[PDB]
Symmetry: D2
Subunit: 30 residues, 4 copies
């Protein structure tokens, strides 16, 4: 079953989104 792999692909995209959110906050602070 590939479900678990697709769930890892989701987790990686969530991590990338959170990194971009931190990046935007830092851009705003500067």
């Amino acid at each position: 079953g590939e479900l678990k792999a697709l769930a890892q692909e989701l987790k990686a995209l969530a991590k990338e989104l959170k990194a971009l959110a931190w990046e935007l906050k830092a851009l705003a602070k500067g």
Copy 2:
């Protein structure tokens, strides 16, 4: 500046994505 608020909206969506990824993994395990 609204940037910081938009970055919080992103962080909330990232959290929701990670919760759905954990949910999918649990669905796969069951």
Copy 3:
């Protein structure tokens, strides 16, 4: 099977992300 419902929850989050991306571009243009 709930997979299809979880895939709709993903689609809704993707739509929200794209709306926020358009919002950020408009903030940048202004």
Copy 4:
């Protein structure tokens, strides 16, 4: 200003999320 570039990075992640949602629906149908 980098805002516009960061908004493109968001748009790309939203597109990837929607592709994964379609993929999950197809996995469910099969």
